[PDB]
Structures are given as structure tokens and as C-alpha cells.
Amino acid sequence: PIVQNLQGQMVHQCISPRTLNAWVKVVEEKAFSPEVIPMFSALSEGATPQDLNTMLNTVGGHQAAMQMLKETINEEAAEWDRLHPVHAGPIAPGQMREPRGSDIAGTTSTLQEQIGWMTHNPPIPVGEIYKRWIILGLNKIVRMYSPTSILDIRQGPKEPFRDYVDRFYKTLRAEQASQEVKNAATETLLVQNANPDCKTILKALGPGATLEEMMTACQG
Amino acid sequence: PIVQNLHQAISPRTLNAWVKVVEEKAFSPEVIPMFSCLSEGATPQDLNTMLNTVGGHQAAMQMLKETINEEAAEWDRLHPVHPIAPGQMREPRGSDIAGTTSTLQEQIGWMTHNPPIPVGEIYKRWIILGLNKIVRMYSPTSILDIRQGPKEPFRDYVDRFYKTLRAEQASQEVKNAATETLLVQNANPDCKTILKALGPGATLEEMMTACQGV
Amino acid sequence: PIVQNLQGQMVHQAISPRTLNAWVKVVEEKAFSPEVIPMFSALSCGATPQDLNCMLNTVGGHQAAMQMLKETINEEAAEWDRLHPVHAGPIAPGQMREPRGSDIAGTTSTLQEQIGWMTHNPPIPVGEIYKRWIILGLNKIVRMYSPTSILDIRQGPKEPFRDYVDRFYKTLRAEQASQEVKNAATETLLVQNANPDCKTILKALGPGATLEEMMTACQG
Amino acid sequence: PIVQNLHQAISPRTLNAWVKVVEEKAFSPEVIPMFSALSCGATPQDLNCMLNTVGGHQAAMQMLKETINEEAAEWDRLHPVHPIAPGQMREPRGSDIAGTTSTLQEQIGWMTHNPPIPVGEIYKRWIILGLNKIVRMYSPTSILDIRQGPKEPFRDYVDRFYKTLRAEQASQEVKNAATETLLVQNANPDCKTILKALGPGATLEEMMTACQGV
Amino acid sequence: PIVQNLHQCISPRTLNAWVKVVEEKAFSPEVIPMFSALSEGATPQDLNTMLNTVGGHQAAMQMLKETINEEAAEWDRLHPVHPIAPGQMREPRGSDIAGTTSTLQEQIGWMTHNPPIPVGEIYKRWIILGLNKIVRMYSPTSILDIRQGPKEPFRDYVDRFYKTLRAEQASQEVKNAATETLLVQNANPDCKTILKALGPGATLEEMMTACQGV
Amino acid sequence: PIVQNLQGQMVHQAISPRTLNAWVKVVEEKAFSPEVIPMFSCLSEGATPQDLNTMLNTVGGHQAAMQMLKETINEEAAEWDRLHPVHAGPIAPGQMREPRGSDIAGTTSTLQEQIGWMTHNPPIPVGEIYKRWIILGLNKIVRMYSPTSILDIRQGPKEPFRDYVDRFYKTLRAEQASQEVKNAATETLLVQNANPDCKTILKALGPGATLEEMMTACQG
Numbered sequence A: 001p002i003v004q005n006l007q008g009q010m011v012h013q014c015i016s017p018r019t020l021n022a023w024v025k026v027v028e029e030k031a032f033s034p035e036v037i038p039m040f041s042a043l044s045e046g047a048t049p050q051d052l053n054t055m056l057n058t059v060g061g062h063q064a065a066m067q068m069l070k071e072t073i074n075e076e077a078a079e080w081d082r083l084h085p086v087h088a089g090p091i092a093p094g095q096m097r098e099p100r101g102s103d104i105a106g107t108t109s110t111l112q113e114q115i116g117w118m119t120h121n122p123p124i125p126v127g128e129i130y131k132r133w134i135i136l137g138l139n140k141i142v143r144m145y146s147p148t149s150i151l152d153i154r155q156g157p158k159e160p161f162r163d164y165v166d167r168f169y170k171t172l173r174a175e176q177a178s179q180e181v182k183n184a185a186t187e188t189l190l191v192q193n194a195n196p197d198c199k200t201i202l203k204a205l206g207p208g209a210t211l212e213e214m215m216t217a218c219q220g
Numbered sequence B: 001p002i003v004q005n006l007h008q009a010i011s012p013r014t015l016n017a018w019v020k021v022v023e024e025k026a027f028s029p030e031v032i033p034m035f036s037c038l039s040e041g042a043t044p045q046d047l048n049t050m051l052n053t054v055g056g057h058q059a060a061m062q063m064l065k066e067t068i069n070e071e072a073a074e075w076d077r078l079h080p081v082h083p084i085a086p087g088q089m090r091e092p093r094g095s096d097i098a099g100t101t102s103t104l105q106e107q108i109g110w111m112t113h114n115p116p117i118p119v120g121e122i123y124k125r126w127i128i129l130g131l132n133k134i135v136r137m138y139s140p141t142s143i144l145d146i147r148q149g150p151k152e153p154f155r156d157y158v159d160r161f162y163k164t165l166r167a168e169q170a171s172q173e174v175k176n177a178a179t180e181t182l183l184v185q186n187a188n189p190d191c192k193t194i195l196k197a198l199g200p201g202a203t204l205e206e207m208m209t210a211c212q213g214v
Numbered sequence C: 001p002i003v004q005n006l007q008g009q010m011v012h013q014a015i016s017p018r019t020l021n022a023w024v025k026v027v028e029e030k031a032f033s034p035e036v037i038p039m040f041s042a043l044s045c046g047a048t049p050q051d052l053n054c055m056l057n058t059v060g061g062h063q064a065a066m067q068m069l070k071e072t073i074n075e076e077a078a079e080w081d082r083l084h085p086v087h088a089g090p091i092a093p094g095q096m097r098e099p100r101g102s103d104i105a106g107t108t109s110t111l112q113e114q115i116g117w118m119t120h121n122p123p124i125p126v127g128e129i130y131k132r133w134i135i136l137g138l139n140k141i142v143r144m145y146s147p148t149s150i151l152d153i154r155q156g157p158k159e160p161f162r163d164y165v166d167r168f169y170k171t172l173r174a175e176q177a178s179q180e181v182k183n184a185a186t187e188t189l190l191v192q193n194a195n196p197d198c199k200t201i202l203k204a205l206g207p208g209a210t211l212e213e214m215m216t217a218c219q220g
Numbered sequence D: 001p002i003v004q005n006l007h008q009a010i011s012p013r014t015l016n017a018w019v020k021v022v023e024e025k026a027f028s029p030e031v032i033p034m035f036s037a038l039s040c041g042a043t044p045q046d047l048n049c050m051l052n053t054v055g056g057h058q059a060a061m062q063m064l065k066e067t068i069n070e071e072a073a074e075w076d077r078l079h080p081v082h083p084i085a086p087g088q089m090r091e092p093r094g095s096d097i098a099g100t101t102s103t104l105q106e107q108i109g110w111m112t113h114n115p116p117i118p119v120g121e122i123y124k125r126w127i128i129l130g131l132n133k134i135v136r137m138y139s140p141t142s143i144l145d146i147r148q149g150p151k152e153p154f155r156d157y158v159d160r161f162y163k164t165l166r167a168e169q170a171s172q173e174v175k176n177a178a179t180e181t182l183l184v185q186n187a188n189p190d191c192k193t194i195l196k197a198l199g200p201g202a203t204l205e206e207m208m209t210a211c212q213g214v
Numbered sequence E: 001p002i003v004q005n006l007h008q009c010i011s012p013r014t015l016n017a018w019v020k021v022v023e024e025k026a027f028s029p030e031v032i033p034m035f036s037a038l039s040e041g042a043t044p045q046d047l048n049t050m051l052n053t054v055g056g057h058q059a060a061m062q063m064l065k066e067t068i069n070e071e072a073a074e075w076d077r078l079h080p081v082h083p084i085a086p087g088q089m090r091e092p093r094g095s096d097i098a099g100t101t102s103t104l105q106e107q108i109g110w111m112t113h114n115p116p117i118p119v120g121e122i123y124k125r126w127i128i129l130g131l132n133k134i135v136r137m138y139s140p141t142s143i144l145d146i147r148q149g150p151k152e153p154f155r156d157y158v159d160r161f162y163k164t165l166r167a168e169q170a171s172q173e174v175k176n177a178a179t180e181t182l183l184v185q186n187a188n189p190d191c192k193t194i195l196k197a198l199g200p201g202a203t204l205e206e207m208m209t210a211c212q213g214v
Numbered sequence F: 001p002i003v004q005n006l007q008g009q010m011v012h013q014a015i016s017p018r019t020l021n022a023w024v025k026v027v028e029e030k031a032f033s034p035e036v037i038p039m040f041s042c043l044s045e046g047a048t049p050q051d052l053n054t055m056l057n058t059v060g061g062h063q064a065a066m067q068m069l070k071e072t073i074n075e076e077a078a079e080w081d082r083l084h085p086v087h088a089g090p091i092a093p094g095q096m097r098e099p100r101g102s103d104i105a106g107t108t109s110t111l112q113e114q115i116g117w118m119t120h121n122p123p124i125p126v127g128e129i130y131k132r133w134i135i136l137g138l139n140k141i142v143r144m145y146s147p148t149s150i151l152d153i154r155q156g157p158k159e160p161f162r163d164y165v166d167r168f169y170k171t172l173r174a175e176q177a178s179q180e181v182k183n184a185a186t187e188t189l190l191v192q193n194a195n196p197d198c199k200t201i202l203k204a205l206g207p208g209a210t211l212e213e214m215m216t217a218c219q220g
């Protein structure tokens, strides 16, 4: 990665085995649970497209997913080559070339070319652009790998309400709805899908009750 | 974070530490001090990273979102944004402090600017307020229900008592004031008699020494 | 904490998650065994009163004890306010205020005010003063939490003497006697409380025998 | 390694990391990317250290030696050594790149010299070529033999399929081209019918969504 | 410690390391070299920290106190303190080296002063002398009692033999001199005959090769 | 150890508890398996003779071996004193003495004297010289501790060929033959010692077949 710490200077450094090992373990244990993505984002801060490839490529298993993730990266590379066509010309001595889709994705560029683009002024953040493509790819996978439809999350007859809500908002997180639409499934589905005893208690509350108020209500 | 030595990337060890604490301890009161100590010098981005890498307890994390919205709203009411002075940068809105609508660059901007605009420490304050509500919610038993068993060591009973109290968060005036009242009333019969016999102004040392024997 | 390492300069740094995790584990495992206190002292070298509060406040459980520890800190704060009364006056531009009991204890001061006092010349070591109060508090707890009275430590009829001595001096450590009074319980209690066979052997040694000599003697 | 900040000793943590990965994973394809990432800026000495601290898989490590010999021979054929210019150092032979006949001093010499002679990165290339052969060898089942079971989730079947393929190393043209052919032909009957019914231009998403239901 | 790079606080990892070694290994001889290596550049405060964070083995730690007192007494006898030169600091008494009556400031003073007064390394010497006594004490079996079993591999027997010897601390002249004598006399009958048949000037290699077969 | 990292400067540093703990564990677990030696070499890069002694001396157990290793170090010290006789003379102010066998081995020198020799120009690499002696010593032990003779490694009747080869070349590694003589035991012993079914397949290959080709051949 590249972050500014060598005094005032901003020097490149080798991806940390601890960062790698961290990312591989999270993927092994958690299997594209939604929280994996924020973890990916946080382990890959200031990551070069090489670094990103290292993290993705050291995942053994979930290869179905990693293939899907390749397909997505290709789609976002194609769309980039359509939007930014390279005007083929000999490189002026003081400049470097414009990066193609495949160059951002780290497939056709060198670490030198990648450090070039990111540390150039104005910046060409090939790291952060490729990251954007990957994350878009993971989101699709997370939505895919979410086991149950939100419709199917129903509070059991003996199940604590706090447990039911915990599943409900977990499911929702995976089946990625914007936190406007998550806040709007609150006063609708969550109630409709509660068990009979606790549904009655939640209807009796009236509208516009907070999540605190609903969970306090069904505590028994 | 932003650290004064000789910005830095949030440490995988810090993340892993915070995620584990949340996994194991489940909004036990001691979680919050841990949050505060793992998030020293944290940018609002960093804070979001820590909160967002918690899988599970999503009920709670939703509640914590609701609280952050309330503290953002109250900020936009108190500071309504009205043209950028050449040497300065823009004024941060509720959503900008909370890291939702700002960049890491804008956040580093505000904290390292003179005079300082500590968007890190302000958002932290909002989060902690949010966790407190959750901790109070997740506390299993009411202080009223903590009663010393007939064979239960007094030291064990007090340990539950003041744990419960910590969760059902009471001011250190009201914690000090439940001592000479409830703790005694809720002790077992043998040890209650011993604690009444002590008279009023008795320390916790003196009470626990007293009921060591029974 | 603050220790001098940024070249010759002496810079403040964030309390290390590893230091915290270390201290919390020791408290979890060892439960105010005497060795906990030296560990506390060694994990809190150069600690600001904020840092100290962090370490104490991240202990969940032993809350009975942590309440007791609060009571003690209040007693040492009161005694400080009696000894150093603040003369209410507007702060001269080049100075800072005098710290009250509650300011040392980190309850009413900021990290800025704390760094102020410690790095000021002459030094006002609010870190080291609060530490002194805490440790006094833990000592009381350790003495409290010591399970058996030294009187009750008696060598069993089949128990190796080296085992008996190990309990004996452990108990003594908890029931904190000065290492003059620990050295003086040697040639008295330790012998009186040994089993019959080995007591006879230890009396036969005469006075002024070392611990080595006594333990060599009762090897059988 | 040789690292640009503000030579260094190979980190016990790097060594321990690499040895464990080889112990646990046994030339699974993902081992190689891990090798590449643990050996960033590695001197040919460092590389030998990593390979030589692998106990066991000695069959493989012998094979890996044979390959390194082949790439050393091919180098000595392409660059035959013919007197040392006052400002310069000698030209590296096959055996000198491979770290067998050079010193750490000579290796630091070549890499930090201008123009750079990246003996680290050249030897790495030879090793990786060697591991690829071993990975292809150690892959247990032929892609032909990966068939979706009658009760096996399609997501599970695809996961084996593309794992196998990874080992039996195929170009990302030939990986993309086994998709719309073998993967379908080797699916179970119920899900094959569903995948044929999709028509030709179907993504992996679309295929896996399709067979989620069955 | 005091470390020359480009005082520092004793590392929690150093502490944790030392406490674990004492917990697990129980004054096995190898503990002492470990003590010496974890306490490189240690101030007398640091040393006290390491010794004082050992819970348990308190019998031993008391003995170790007695020894430190003996080496402090012997120091006060050899250096009796007799007015502070303007550029200098006071002369350290037995109790000042042992860290009991000095401050960290006074200790950093003595070690970083010119000429150097290595209070760290002097106290260390006293401690190690103390541990040696304990190790010799805690050694379970007398070298006389180490005898090769009738079915026991010779390599196993020698491993006990030289372990025992290490504890019952013998000079490397007396260790080298118990070789061609006791080790043979205490071998089992079959292998003793083989070792006598070797003649006198035989290495440990030669003896262990000889009894590999039986 | 001493490696050049304090900017351009080359400063001595304390042997890392993690390095020690690493080396002790490897010796505990692996018991002079051949791979131990490369590990020793890699944990002891830039090691002073003191450091080396620390690593060797913190091995508890395998004391038989550590005694043998002492005997070897003495033999290489004697041979050094024969080759470099010290001419007894008063030390010229700008110089230091010539190191004796026992001085290299760290037994009779100080850390100061050792840092002296290594950082002197031209260098006197007492670290790297003692290391050479140790490694020679470990090789003898590894060859000793190798359980079976290469002659005795025979492919079982049901044993996968890849398993048999893995033992074969492991054994060989211990019974240290040069990788010319390891490459020459390939087309001879490995075949002669294969099981009947797979021997026939390997003879049928002709001479000069690679290890790949042989292992591909006996895959069934």
C-alpha cells in the first residue's frame, strides 16, 4: 500500500502478512456475510491494484464466487474502456500513458506503473478505482449468498423478539436495501412478521414507534 | 487515526480487537470503555469501519443508527449552514461528522485545521451515547431482582449487584446511594442482620469484611 | 502514556490495545493475586490519569472490588484537597491551574490538562500520583481477597515441605507483611506450622538457619 | 528483503507464515499467490531460506530443484559470460541468480545497482514456474471427473469445478470457455435442463441463480 | 531497558514471555539463559518487575531475596560510602543497585553516566547467582541415580544424564570429565560392554553411534 | 544482532524474544529434522556469538545433542588456534587483539569485543565464523538423529508412490548427500526400492526420466 508516514514523505510498502492472514481468515470463517465487505475495505486502505489482487488471489475456496467476482471486474473494465478511449501516441518524456480497464485491474500494468498513477499530480487513484469494482462484485455475491429471503424471516412462537429482530436486520443487511429502505421495512414487515402475541403488542403501540420502543414493548 | 509521533491506516489488530470484544461480551458495560480506548484519535471513517465490521447484534446496530440520526438532526438544528473564506474549508453538517457525506480528506482537514474541528471526537460522543442506550437495554435483570442467595457468598452477591447497577447506568452519586440502602435490603437474612448492626456510615470494605464470616 | 523515544523528544501516544488486552486478561485469570499489582505497575509505566481510568474501566466483573477501589480513590482525593487548597484566581497567561483531587483521578480534567501537568517544569506527575492512589486501593483488595489466614496454612501429613512453604509465603504475600516481617515469620510460624516429622527436623537445626537450609533439611 | 522506507533480515513471522501455509494447504493453487506476497522484495538468499525451511513435501522440493536447474541452464545458454569495468561488478550466471554460488553482498549489489539487475525477481519467476508444475501434479481429480451429485447444491459443485480448474492451470480464456461447456454438461440432470433452457450468453451469476431453486 | 537505536518501557511481551517461562518450566536450567536474554539492557527496576510478576514459586522467590541480601551486604562491606562533586551523582549502595532504595531516574543516571556504572548488569549478576542455587535445589534426581534402563534407548539415557548434570551445575571441565566415567558406569549392561570395548579417548558421537545398535 | 537500518547507520540491537521463542519452539517440535538447520541460519542472521549462545543455551532437553554440539565447537576452536597463533604483544592504542577459538565461541570475549571485531574494517566476522562451527555441529546431529538408513526406505505394497518418494528424499536429506549425489540416487535406488508393480513401470520408462515423469508414471 501507500500511506504518508516516512516523516512527511509518502512511501510504498509491502502488503503485511498479518493483513493478508487477517483477510484470508475472515473469508474462511464468515463466507461473504455482509460484515466481510467493510473488513475488505479496511484491510485494503491505500492498496495498489497488485495488493488487491494478492488479497483476492490468496483466497482458496469460494472459487465459484471468485469467478463471479472476475466476471463483474471484466464488466466494469469494459465500461471504463468505452468511457475512456486511449488515443494511441508516443509517450511525451515527462508524462505516463492513460490506464486501460485491464491496467487498473492490475492484470496488464506493473507495480511501478501503479505507483506512478497514484503518486502523480493530479492523482489517478487506480487503487481506489479497482477497489470500487471489487466491492460492487462482492455486494452481488453477498446478496447471492444470503440464505433466507426477508419475507421468510418470521418470529418463532417461543423465540425472544430481540433474537427475531437480530435475524431480521441481518437478512436485510445481506439483501442489500439502502438504510432509508431498512428504516422503512421497520414499521411494516418487522411487525407483520412478529409472532401473534408480540404483533398485537406492536400494533397497540401505534405508528412511528422507534426500534427501542418496539423491543422494550416485546421484552416479555 | 491521527497520531502525534516523530494520518495512519486503522490497524487490523485494532479492528480484530474491537470485533472480538463485541462477539464475546455482547454490550456488557465494559465494552464501551474498550470502544473509547480502541478508537483514540479515530476519524469518523475509522469509527464507521469499527461499527460496520460488527456482523450480528444488527438489531442493536440499527438502534445505534437511529441514535446517531437523532444527534445529527439536533446538530443541524443548532448549527444551520448559511461562502468559503479563501484560507478555510466548509462547515461540517450532522451527516459530515457521522462520516456518511464527507471524505477522509475532508475529515483530516477539519481535525488538523486551526482552530481544530474535532469531528472524530464529536461523532465518538454520539456513538457512545448510542451504546449506553443499548447497554441499558441489554442488561438482563433489574437491580430490584438482584437478591443474595441463602448459600451465596456476599462477595459474589455484591459482584452481581454492582455489575447490574453498572449496566442500568446510574450517576456515581446514585451508585454510592444504592450502597447503604438496596445492597443491604437485598442481602440474605443472616448477613442483613450483620449489616444493619454495623450502623449507617459503613464503607464497602467494612460491609464485605463483616459478611466474609457468614 | 508519555516516554521519551521520538528521537530525543518526549511525545504522548495512544494506550496500546495489546497493553489493555494484557491487563484485562491478567485480571480475568488471576483475580487480585498479589502478582497482579506489579503487573499493573509495569503495564501503566508513564500512564496519564486517562490511561489509568481506561485500564480500570475495561475490567468487567470484580465490580464489588472496583467499587471498593473507587471508595479508596475518593478518600485519597479528599486528603489531597485538604493538604492542597486551590487559591481561586484568574489563570496568568503563561501558567495552568493547580490540580484538585478529582483532576488527578482523571474525572474532571482533560488529556490536554494532564499532558500539561506532567510535561510542565517543575513536573506535576498527575499520572504517578493517581497510580499511587490506585495501588493503595488494590493492596486493600488483595489483602481482602487472600483466601486463608497465615495461621491456617499448615503442612499436611503427606505434603512435600517445598509445597507447604510455597503456600505459606504466597499467603503471607497477599496478607501484605513487610519483607522484614516476612523474614521474621520464617524462623517462627513456618516451623510451628510444619508437620510433626519435619518440625522435629527444623527445631534440631537450631536458630538462624536460612530457607535453603530448612528446605534442604525437609527434602525427605 | 530490500525495502524502500524513510536490506533487512527475513522476518521470523514471514518464515513461520510461509512454512505453516505449506504444512496446512499442500500445494493448493492459493499457496503460490501467498508465496509471491510473502517474498515481496526477496533476495535469492531469502527465497532459498523460505524453500529450505519446508520440511516434508521433499518429493516436490526435489522436482522444484530440477525445474530451477532447467531455468538456470536456459539462462547460461542465453547469456554466456565472456573483464570487470572499474565502476561495475561481474555478470550473474544461472547458479548466481538461484543464490547457490553468490553471497548476500553480491545479491544486494545486483538489485541496488543502476541499471538494476533484479536477481530476486528473476529467481522468483523460476521458483513460481516450478510450483505451478507441482500444483498441476498434486491436483487430485481431473476436471472431467468433477460431476454435480444428485443432492449436491449447485453452488457447491461450481466451487469444486472452478477449484479443480484452478489447479489444472488453464488460461482465463480457457477458464471462461469451460464455463458455457463442461460446467453445464457435468451438472446433475435436473439443473442441466434448467441451464440449457437459459440459452447461450448466460453469466455465472445467472446460472447459479437459476439452479439455486433446484 | 536502555537500548542504542537511531530508556524504553519494559515490553508487555517481554513480561508475558518471562512469566510464562517460569509458569511452564519451573527453574529447569534453560530458564536462566532465557532470563538473561529477556533482561538485556534491563534497569534494576525492570529486573524487579520481572521477578515480582512471578506469582507462585514464592518459596524460591524468598530464597532468591535472601541471596540478593547476601550480595548487597558483601557490596556494602567492599564499597563503604564516605560529598557530591558538582558534575557527578552519588555512589550506589547495595540496596540502590537492587532497585529497592533508588529511582528509575537515579538508575538511568548511573548506566548512561561516563564512566558507566552498570547497575543493571551488576544486579542481574546477583539475581542469576540466586537462580543457580534454586535450579540446583529444584533438580529432582542426583546424577548418581540416573541409570540407563534395560529397554531404554541410549540416546534417551544420555539426554536425562546431561540434563540432570546441567541442573546440578558442574564446570564444563567436570561435565567433560563425568562423560568417560559415570555415563559409562551408569549405562545398562549390554551397552556398557560395547562402551568399554571402545577404549578410552571416545567422543560422545562415537559412544552414541556405538549404542545406537543395542 | 547487527544489521544496517538506523537510517544509513548499522546499530547493534537486543536478540528478539520472538526470535528466541521461534527457535526454541522449532527445536521442541521438530527434533533436528533437517529443515531445523536452515531455520537456525535464518533466525541467527547478523547474530553476535553471544546471541548464538543464547539461542543454543535456551534449548532445554536434547542435552545429549547439545553436549555433542559443544564437542564439535571445541574441535573447530582447537583447529582455529592451530591455524591462527596469537603473537602476545601490548595492544597498540588504535587496534584490538586477535580473537582466539574460545573468543569467537563467545566463552572468553565480551559483547563489546564481539561488536568490535564485526564492525572493524576490514571485518572480523566472529558472528558468521562461530555460526559456521555450530552448523557443522548440527549437521552431525541431524545425520545421527535420522531414524532409518536410505537402504531401508522401501515403497510399501499399498503405499502411494508420491508418499514413498516423500520419505525417500526426506531420509536422504537427513543422511546429508550433496544435491549432485541426491540427483544420482534418483535413477538408481529410488527405482530399485519402489514396490514390484511400480518398479516394472519405472524400468519400462528407460534411463534419464525426470522425477515428474517417474511420479506421473506411478500415479496409479
Ligand code: NA
Binding pocket: A210, A211, A212, A213, B062, B063, B064, B066, B067
Ligand atoms: Na432506537
Ligand code: NA
Binding pocket: B136, B168, B169, B170
Ligand atoms: Na436506568
Ligand code: NA
Binding pocket: D062, D063, D064, D066, D067, F210, F211, F212, F213
Ligand atoms: Na521434475
Ligand code: NA
Binding pocket: D136, D168, D169, D170
Ligand atoms: Na493442465
Ligand code: NA
Binding pocket: C210, C211, C212, C213, E062, E063, E064, E066, E067
Ligand atoms: Na536461602
Ligand code: NA
Binding pocket: E136, E168, E169, E170
Ligand atoms: Na552440585
